[PDB]
């Protein structure tokens, strides 16, 4: 029975600050994050037709990626059914940073029930600008 309850301006701001990289692939992002400290991250366009944006981040010698879902004016990470979401990309990331600070930011390699989760500590956005 239930019913449901500016992205451009944000992305303009994040591009101007440098940490929204626009149309780079997962492989390009891996290169950009190869020599930055663990926890570093960036936002970019997703190559998958089902999504517009992805988060790439460094942890434990690996660059990992996740897609961002955007619906009903809100944002979440993908494959998170039945979540409230956040009203901006920045709010989504800030929430995740706060979870990282508490030891609650973690990932899995499967959504099978019982899949292991692995902690990651996020730090700093990575700028696309050479200085």
């Amino acid at each position: 029975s239930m019913v449901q309850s500016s992205l451009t301006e944000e992305l303009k701001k994040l591009a101007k600050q440098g940490w929204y990289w626009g149309p780079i692939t997962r492989w390009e992002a891996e290169g950009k994050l190869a020599n930055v400290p663990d926890g570093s991250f960036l936002v970019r366009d997703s190559s998958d037709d089902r999504y517009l944006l992805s988060l790439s981040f460094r942890s434990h010698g690996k660059t990992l990626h996740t897609r961002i879902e955007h619906s009903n004016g809100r944002f979440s990470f993908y494959e998170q059914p039945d979540v409230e979401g956040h009203t901006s990309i920045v709010d989504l990331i800030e929430h995740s940073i706060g979870d990282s600070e508490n030891g609650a930011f973690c990932y899995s390699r499967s959504r099978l029930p019982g899949s292991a989760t692995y902690p990651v500590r996020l730090t700093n956005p990575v700028s696309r600008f050479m200085q």
Binding site: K62, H65, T66, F77, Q80, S96, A104, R109, R111
Partner: peptide, 9 residues
């Protein structure tokens, strides 16, 4: 492909 799922909190 190094894509992972963030655990919801």
């Amino acid at each position: 492909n190094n894509y992972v799922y963030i655990d919801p909190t």
